[PDB]
Design a protein around this ligand. Structure first.
Ligand SMILES: *[C@H]1O[C@H](CO)[C@H](O)[C@H](O)[C@H]1NC(C)=O
Lengths: 268, 14, 277, 22
């Protein structure tokens, strides 16, 4: 391959061949960056036409997933060609190369991207518009009492910072899946839950206008209450159903979702 | 008690 | 099952499209479908099986005609342009384009004093035959053959004064990009890493071949191009001059090179002005 | 000046804006 990744103790070192597409045509070093933060290269090797990136495991907008036995750090190499002689045309396409580092591990919340049958976890690549993201939120089964898990908000963006522009709220107002309210989406929480401390939901795939990297990050605010406690306008998981024109909670009284339509579920 | 958790990058292909 | 049905009638075409175009379950909105680069609206719809119909004269809505020796070919397309999402920062659905084609059976003189027919053909790599207008990728090369009908007239030499790429048959629209300019300078070959050039020698003086590296327009999610060229003829044995020539930039030699004529007829290509006094 | 404007197309490209050589 044209990309070599060294997963070291507390950094990763990525070496990229400037002959990135095996055509023999060399890309510009300055057109390659690391992570959604677009960090610049740390060194070049002219003799071998390579470009090297070195970053701490938490730097440059990397994302960590904590599994029972493993820590997985995911990032990417961005190739963004400099302008053609006349910028209205493109002679060379951009590209994104996913980078991953796995480490044995030495309340914990987690989000996992599941296959459509929810049997297994699936790759983060190979989505096309028309596809559905199946997201499973969960919270570790620590000794402590039985819990119920909610997702207060999820925001999509072009980097792990959901406050950056552009961004798009998928879940808002303390558990209202607002993406399901509009257009022709089928986005919704799944019912019933597998367990009270697991919450599943599906989102129609989308992408951000004007973004030529064609990727998204989703950042969610997860929280728990005691398992037994009644859902209320502050703690709930509601979906909109266009057919019936109504909000519907995963559990609890129908009217707990009323605030979803008004766009404010804070209690004053 | 709560936490922010990020998932991605999700890459779209055509 | 026929997702797109085309009736090629005497002086119009009628195109019928199933709104279950993509088989995603979801029917598309009739208003999201239009005909031709002009985006003409549908002429009728039918709820029985959710179809949408377009009817237009053969020359309407930005269609393009090719005149071959024995056939007339009219080419257009059906546009699918999903309405924007409620929040415009995101896109859930890509636009699509469906190509549409209709085929129809179709004392010497001097134009410098009984009509010339000019034509551009997209050719296979080996120039043996004509090839499909689909399946192009960046990296690929367009082999374009310009020609002018040869029936019972004086011998002619053919030039291409300019070619402009754009998103519709109107080369004056934005965006557009001049591939050939300044009266026959293949300026696309002057820049970046292209190998675009006129071919030498010509097969006949009244044919001119050239190769253009494929490119696409930034921001265009339909993924198409139209190329419109201004072709002209002179008497065959007339000497090329700065206003009548076919010049390529040869990167290896770092100079302009005419298909025929003296080397210095291409000088004005570098300066960007081949207009006379 | 004997001449004409001739249009060629539509030339349809791939929908993959990340397409590259193997
Ligand atoms: C017309 O073309 C023929 C064949 O090329 C001869 O050149 C002929 O002398 C021409 N006649 C006129 C009147 O131009």
């Amino acid at each position: 391959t044209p990309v070599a990744v060294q997963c070291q103790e507390a950094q990763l070192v990525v070496t990229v061949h400037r002959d990135l597409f095996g055509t023999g045509r060399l890309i510009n070093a300055a057109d390659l960056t690391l992570g959604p933060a677009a960090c610049k290269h740390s060194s070049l090797n002219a003799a071998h036409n390579t470009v090297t990136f070195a970053a701490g495991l938490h730097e440059c907008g990397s994302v960590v997933q904590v599994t029972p036995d493993t820590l997985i750090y995911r990032t990417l190499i961005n190739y963004d060609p400099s302008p053609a002689s006349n910028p209205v045309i493109i002679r060379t396409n951009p590209a994104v190369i996913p980078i991953e580092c796995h480490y044995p591990r030495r309340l914990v919340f987690s989000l996992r991207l599941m296959s459509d049958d929810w049997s297994t976890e699936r790759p983060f690549t190979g989505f096309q518009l028309g596809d559905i993201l199946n997201i499973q939120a969960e919270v570790s089964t620590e000794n402590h009492v039985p819990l119920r898990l909610f997702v207060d908000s999820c925001v999509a963006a072009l980097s792990p910072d959901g406050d950056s522009s552009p961004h798009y709220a998928i879940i808002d107002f303390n558990g209202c899946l607002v993406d399901g309210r509009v257009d022709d989406t089928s986005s919704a929480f799944i019912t019933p839950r597998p367990r009270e401390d697991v919450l599943r939901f599906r989102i129609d795939v989308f992408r951000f206008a004007g973004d030529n990297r064609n990727l998204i990050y989703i950042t969610c605010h997860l929280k728990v209450t005691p398992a037994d406690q009644g859902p209320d306008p502050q703690n709930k998981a509601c979906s909109f159903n266009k057919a019936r024109n109504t909000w519907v909670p995963v559990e609890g009284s129908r009217d707990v979702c009323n605030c979803c339509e008004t766009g404010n579920c804070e209690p004053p | 008690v709560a936490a922010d958790v990020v998932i991605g990058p999700v890459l779209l292909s055509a």
